[PDB]
Design an enzyme around this catalytic site. Sequence first.
Site, PDB file in Angstrom:
ATOM      1  N   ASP A 147       0.838  -1.189   0.000  1.00 20.12           N
ATOM      2  CA  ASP A 147       0.000   0.000   0.000  1.00 20.12           C
ATOM      3  C   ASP A 147       0.877   1.245   0.000  1.00 20.12           C
ATOM      4  OD1 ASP A 147      -2.440   1.487   0.256  1.00 20.12           O
ATOM      5  OD2 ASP A 147      -1.790   1.913   2.332  1.00 20.12           O
TER       6      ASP A 147
ATOM      7  N   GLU B 167       4.395  -7.432   7.388  1.00 19.45           N
ATOM      8  CA  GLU B 167       3.138  -8.117   7.100  1.00 19.45           C
ATOM      9  C   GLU B 167       3.241  -9.239   6.066  1.00 19.45           C
ATOM     10  OE1 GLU B 167       0.376  -4.970   6.020  1.00 19.45           O
ATOM     11  OE2 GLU B 167      -0.136  -4.605   8.102  1.00 19.45           O
TER      12      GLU B 167
ATOM     13  N   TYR C  61      -5.615  -2.447  13.373  1.00 19.04           N
ATOM     14  CA  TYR C  61      -6.457  -1.310  13.046  1.00 19.04           C
ATOM     15  C   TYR C  61      -7.862  -1.543  13.571  1.00 19.04           C
ATOM     16  CZ  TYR C  61      -2.725   0.287   9.923  1.00 19.04           C
ATOM     17  OH  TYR C  61      -1.499   0.689   9.392  1.00 19.04           O
TER      18      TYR C  61
ATOM     19  N   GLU D  35       1.774  -0.214  13.838  1.00 16.06           N
ATOM     20  CA  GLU D  35       0.844   0.597  13.058  1.00 16.06           C
ATOM     21  C   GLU D  35      -0.520   0.524  13.721  1.00 16.06           C
ATOM     22  OE1 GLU D  35       0.595  -0.418   8.944  1.00 16.06           O
ATOM     23  OE2 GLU D  35       2.762  -0.738   8.667  1.00 16.06           O
TER      24      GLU D  35
END
Lengths: 569, 569
Positions: free
Chosen positions: B159, B393, B446, B482
Site C-alpha cells: 500500500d 506483514e 487497526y 501501526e
Amino acid sequence: DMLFPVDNEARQIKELNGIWKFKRDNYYKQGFEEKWFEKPLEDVIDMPVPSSYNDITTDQELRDHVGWVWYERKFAVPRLWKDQRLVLRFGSVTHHAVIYLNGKEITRHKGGFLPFEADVTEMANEGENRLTVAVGNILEWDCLPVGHIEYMEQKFDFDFFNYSGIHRPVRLYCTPKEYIEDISVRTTVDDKDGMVHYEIKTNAEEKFIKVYIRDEKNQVVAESNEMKDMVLVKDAQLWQPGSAYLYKLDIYFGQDHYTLPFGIRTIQLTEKQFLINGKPFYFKGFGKHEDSDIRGKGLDEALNVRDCELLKWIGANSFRTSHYPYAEEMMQMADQKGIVVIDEVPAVGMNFGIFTEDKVNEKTLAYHKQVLKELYQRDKNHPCVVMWSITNEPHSSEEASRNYFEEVTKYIRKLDSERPITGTMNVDVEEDKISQFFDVVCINRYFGWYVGAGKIERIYPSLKTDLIKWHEKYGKPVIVTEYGADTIAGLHKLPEVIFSEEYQKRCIEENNKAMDECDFVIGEHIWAFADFMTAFGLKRVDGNKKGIFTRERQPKTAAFAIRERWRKM
Amino acid sequence: DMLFPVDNEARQIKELNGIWKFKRDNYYKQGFEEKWFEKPLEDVIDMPVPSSYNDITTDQELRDHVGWVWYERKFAVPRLWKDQRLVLRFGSVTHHAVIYLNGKEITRHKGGFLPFEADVTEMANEGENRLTVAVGNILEWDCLPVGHIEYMEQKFDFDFFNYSGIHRPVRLYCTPKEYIEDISVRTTVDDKDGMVHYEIKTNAEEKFIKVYIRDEKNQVVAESNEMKDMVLVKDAQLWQPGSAYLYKLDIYFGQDHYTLPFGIRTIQLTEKQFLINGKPFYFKGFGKHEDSDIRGKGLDEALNVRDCELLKWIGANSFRTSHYPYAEEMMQMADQKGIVVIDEVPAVGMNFGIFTEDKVNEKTLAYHKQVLKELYQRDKNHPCVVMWSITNEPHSSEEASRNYFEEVTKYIRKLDSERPITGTMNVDVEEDKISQFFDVVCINRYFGWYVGAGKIERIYPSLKTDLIKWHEKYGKPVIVTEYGADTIAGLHKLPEVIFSEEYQKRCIEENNKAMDECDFVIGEHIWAFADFMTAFGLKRVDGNKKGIFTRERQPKTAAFAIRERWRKM
Ligand SMILES: [Ca+2]
Ligand SMILES: [Ca+2]
C-alpha cells in the site's frame, strides 16, 4: 383510498408538524412493554416534525439506534368541526408505525415511504387531544427495503443511511360525512381532441354529483353529472415535458368539494424510442434521494425548489425516485414543472442465495404487491409519472427470482395497463433472468469506478460492449439508470485521479461516448444528483460522494460539462 | 564496501544531480533492443535528479508507465583528478538499473533502496563523459518489494505508490589508489568508560595506519596504529535518545583520509523492557515513508529537517523506515538529533499460497539475505539503529513461511549479534508461525478501522485482548507498529464519523487505553506520519489519509492530543 388532502370551502387541513416530544427505547420494545402511550411521555427531548431524528442530536446512541422511538404532541378539535368527518393523515413514518389517540391504539402501518390515515370522527374529543406515535426502524426479510437483524445489529445491503422518523407532514383534516373517497383519471388523444375518462367513488353513489373540467384559466371546458364518464376536451392543451399543462377535475358532491389536477398526455413504447404525445423522449437526469443536511430524509420544500432550479439549469428533463416513493409534494412539483418521473417502490437490498424460503420469500412477495397497490393508488393520477420501477438491483441471477418477479410484474400490469414497467439491473447480462418481463431495460453500470477504476481508456469499449449485449438479449430499449464516480469537492489533480473533480468529468464523458454510438438507448441518468449520507463504510467518505452537486446543492466541475451536453440535446 | 563518500584534503565529491535528459520506452525494452545507449538520447524531456519521474509531467502515460525509462547527462573529469581512483556512486535507482559510460555498459543493479557504485578509473576520459542510466520499475516474485506482471500490468499487494526514478544523489568521487575500503565499530560500556572495538580494511594491508578517536570539539581521546584494536574512552559521552553525542574515528592511511562519526551506546532486552544505556526506552513515533508532493520519493533535505522538527514538536522519539531503507542523509540526521530508528528491509507485499515454488521461493530467499547484507553494510555503524526489521506483514500463517523466515533470521543474526531482530505482523495471532524467531513482537492492528469500523467502544477491548494473546503466545515485549484511521483534513462531524478529524483522535485514544493496560508493550507507532500516495483504489482518497500530518506537513486535530500524551510521557 388516498386522495391528497385539500383546503376549500368544504374541507380543511390542520397541520400537526412543528416540535414534538421524543424519547427512544432503552431496551427492545421498552415502550410497548411499559405501555408508555397510556400517559404523557416523560424524560423527553424536542424533535422536529417532519425530520429524521438521527442527525438532530449530538448523541451517537440516538444516531445509531436500533428499534423503536416514541413521539408525542397535542392537538385540538375546534367546536366548529362538530359534525364533520375527522381524518388523521401521515404522509409517512419510517419504517413502522403504531398510532395512539388519547392512550388508545387506532392504527398501525408497515412501510416507511407511503402515506396512511385513520378515521377519528368518533374518537377525538372537542378541545385537547394527545397523539402518540411509535416509530420503528427494523428491516427484516419481509420488509421493503430488505434487511435483517443479527445478534441487535441491523444488517442490510443497500447504500443509503437507514434514517428513521416522521419524514413527511402530519395532517388532521375534516370532510363532510358524505364525501368523495377516490378518483381515477385516464386520458387519450385523437389528433387535436383530448378524451378524459374519469371514475369517482363516493360513500353515497345515489346522490347528486356535479363534475367540471377547468383549464388553467379556471374556465369550464366540460361538464357532467355522472360519477363515471368519458368527456371530450376540444383542442386539448397537452402536458409536455418541459411545458406542463394541468387541467382540473372540479367535483361538487353534496356538501363536499374536491379538485384534482391532471395532465392530458399519452405514452407509447416503440422498438427503440420512448414516445410522449407521439414525440421521442430521451431521458436526461438523475436518480435522486430524499436527503439533506441535519434533517435526514425529512421533507423540505425549499430544498425541493432549489433542486428543480438546478435540474432546469443543467438541462435535465427527468429523475427517478431512487429507491422509494418520494413525498407527494415533489410529485406535484414535477407535474407543474413538466418533469418526467420514474416512480420506484423500495424493493432494494435484495442482494448481497437471496430468493429462498427463509429470506425473500412468498411473504416478501405478498408485501411487495401491497406496496405496489399503495404506490399506484397514491400516484396513478400524476401525468409526470411515465414508468413504474418495481425493484433496484435485485440478485436476478438466481433462478428462483424469475417466478418472483413474474408475479410482481403481472400484478402492477393488472393495476395499470398504460405505463411501461421496468426495474434496474446490476448482475451480468448473461446471468439475468427477469428483464424479459420488463418493457424497458435499465442497467446500473460503473465502468471506470467499480470496474476498471481509474482506467479511463477502458470505459468507452466496456460500456458499449455491455449495452449491445443487453440489447441483443432482450431486444428492448435501454436506459443507463446509474453511472458516475465519487468526487471530493476541491480535490484537483493533473493528470486526473479517482476522487478528483476532473476524473468525474472524464468518467461520465467516456460513458456518454459509448451511449452515443448505440441506437437503442433512450436515456442517461447520472448517479448521483447530490452527495448523500450512507451507512458507514471504508469506501464512503462521509457518505456517497457521487453527487454532481454537493449535499448543499452547489455544483462540482463536471456539472458544467454535463450542462453543455444536455442543453444542446 | 559502502562507506559514505566524504570531502577532505584527500577525497573529493562531485555531485551529478540537477536536470537530466529523459525518455521512456514506447514498448517493452525498446531502448535495449534499439540500443539507445550507443548514441546520445533523442527526443527527450527534462527530468530532475533526485526525484521520481511519475508526478513531474502532465502525462498520464508516463505516471502509469510499466517497464524501463532512460536518463542521460554529461559529466567532466578535471585534469586535476589525473592519478586518482574514480568512483561513480548511485544512492539508489528504483527499482532496477543498467549504467552506461560513453555508450558501454559498466554495471547493473537490482533493488531500489540501497546504494551501488562502479570503479570508473580506467574507463572515464578527462573532460566530457556521457552517463546513461536505464531505470526499470517491474517487480517480480523474487524482487523486494514483491510484485508480479499479468497480461502488461503490474500487480502487487503493498500500500504505497510504485514510484520509479533516481531518488537519491548521484556522485562521482575520487580517492587515492591505496585507500580505506571498510570500517566497522562496536562499543561496550563499563560504568563511565567506553571501549571502542574497530576493524579497518584497506587496499594494501601491510602499510602503516594512524587511528584517532576525537570528541565533538575535535580533540583526540584515544589513538592507535592498529588496523584492528580496542581503545578506551574514559568519561565517555554516551549517545542518548534525544541527546546525541558522536565521536569520530579519524583514520590516516598513506595519502588517504576518512573520518567516520559513531556513537557509544548499548542495547539490551528484558522480557518487558527495551534498554538503551541501561535505561528503559518506550518507542513513541511513527512508521514513515519517503514521499512528498511533486518529487515522489526523491530525497528532500529541507523536508527532512521539517519532519524532524515535527517529530520533536510532537514528542516523538523514534521512527521505523517503512518499508525500505531510507536515504543515508536521513540516517545521519537521526544520528545527530538523537532519534532512535527501526531499520527495515523492503520485504513487503508477501501477502494477498504465497510461499510456493512459483512465487516467494528460494530465489526470493537468497535475494532477501543479499539485501540484508547490503543494508547491514551501509548502516552497521549508525548508533541511531537499534533494531532490524526483516519484513512487513508477510502471510506468515502458511507453514511454508516457517523455514523461510528461520533462514532469514538466522542470517541477519550472523551479521549482527548485538541488535534485536523483528518483523511486523498482520495475520491472526493463532495462525502466525514465525514470530518465535524474533526478539520483539511487532503487530499492525487497526481496530476501529479495518475491524469494526466506526465502533469506538469496541476498540479498547479488542486491542487489549489481542495484545494479551500475542504476549501469551510468545512471551516477548510487544510494539504496536501501526494503528490509526484515514482522515480528511477539514472533515468535522458531531457525533464523529470515520474519515473525520474527531474520529481519528478518538480511535487513537481508545487504542492507547488498551496499550496503557499492558505492561509488556514497549512502543506505540501511529500509522501514518503524513498522508502519502498509493496505487489507485476505492479506499484511497488521493492516497493514504492516515497521516497525523498532511502531505504538506501540517497537523490535523489529532496531532495536538498525541503531543499532550507523548510530551508528558
Ligand atoms: Ca406528503
Ligand atoms: Ca544517499
